[PDB]
């Protein structure tokens, strides 16, 4: 999964396409707002938000 891949996918279609790709592809995650993504970063790197 790469940034160019994401840009090409987006050029094909909007958010819904990326959400479908999320189901299709393994080892990938997306979040429509920054809070859940930051929670994912926290639980991945095992560090308090500060």
Partner DNA sequence: ATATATATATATATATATATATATATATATATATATATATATATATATATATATATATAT
Residues forming contacts to DNA in the complex (CB under 7 A) are 19, 31-33, 35-36
Closer by beta carbon to DNA, 4 or else 43: 43
Closer by beta carbon to DNA, 4 or else 35: 35
Q: Name the minimum Å distance from CB 45 to DNA.
A: 19
Q: Name the minimum Å distance from CB 25 to DNA.
A: 17
CA distances in angstroms from 33 to 12, 30, 39, 43, listed in the order given: 22, 9, 11, 17
* Measured distance CA(18)–CA(6) in Å, rounded: 8
φ/ψ of 4, rounded to 5, equals: -60, -40
């Amino acid at each position: 999964q790469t940034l160019e891949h994401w840009l090409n996918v987006y050029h094909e279609g909007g958010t819904r396409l990326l959400r479908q790709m999320e189901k299709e592809a393994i080892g990938l995650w997306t979040y429509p707002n920054k809070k859940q993504y930051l929670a994912r970063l926290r639980d991945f790197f095992e560090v308090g938000e500060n």
